[PDB]
Write a protein that binds this ligand. Sequence first.
Ligand SMILES: *CCC(=O)N1CC(n2cc(-c3ccncc3)c(-c3cccc(NC(=O)c4cn(C5CC5)cn4)c3)n2)C1
Length: 271
Amino acid sequence: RILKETEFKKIKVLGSGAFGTVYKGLWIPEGEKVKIPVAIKELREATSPKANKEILDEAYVMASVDNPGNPHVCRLLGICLTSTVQLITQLMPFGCLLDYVREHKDNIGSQYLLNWCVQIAKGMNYLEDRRLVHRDLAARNVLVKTPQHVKITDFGLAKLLGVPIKWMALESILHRIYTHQSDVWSYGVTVWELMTFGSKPYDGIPASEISSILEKGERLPQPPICTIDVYMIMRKCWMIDADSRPKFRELIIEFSKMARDPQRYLVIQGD
Ligand SMILES: *CCC(=O)N1CC(n2cc(-c3ccncc3)c(-c3cccc(NC(=O)c4cn(C5CC5)cn4)c3)n2)C1
């Protein structure tokens, strides 16, 4: 869908960063009498070295991922090209999962945390089936539609417009190699962020020192709520050998087994 600036309106500002700005807005599709609540992401201008017609063609090839789609992967509703690129998707009212876990710390039970792990692995498995590599999986790029339904966003957005060292696999930090097995490493880091209720990975350690710390065998610590069964899964996502890391289909099954008896795998004061 190519959107005209008159089809949508930016009401409030939801987020802001170097990437650009996210707006909570409204969209009235052309020839329809309905107003759909959406989120508009206005990316930073002159970021990409590509023409508008080149970006548009590549985003149309990439949006083929909305077909047949997955419930745990965001659908790109529309794109609007002016001086900036504007991405329009359905509004996710609870924000990102990074903020959600930090704000509801003492109210999240083991059942929720394990279900989120399952849902993220389901969305990632789908992206792997469509052969699209995310490149930026993190708890900040997981959106909360409802506390029981989460979705992955910003997949392939970096590739579309030709740097999170603390979420990158060793081969991505050293050789800029981005496969589905490096997305597994990022997934392990993401799971650690949910398990620690939004802690920042390797806090204080400069990004410049991450690759040397990884080669010494140092990994993210074992979160207080994780039994060794859950920590071993994350620890396997951070292996040096990419092909030995688990697959998204194995992670869905492992975390589904854990979500069937959650108090056995996660120890939370409140369950
Ligand atoms: C919580 C951390 C934070 O501040 N972040 C900003 C970023 N974020 C949030 C949203 C969003 C908020 C509310 N409701 C929905 C989304 C977005 C966002 C907005 C619009 C569009 C997107 N992404 C895409 O449209 C898109 C397209 N692709 C592929 C075709 C290339 C991938 N993603 C995201 N961003 C989290």
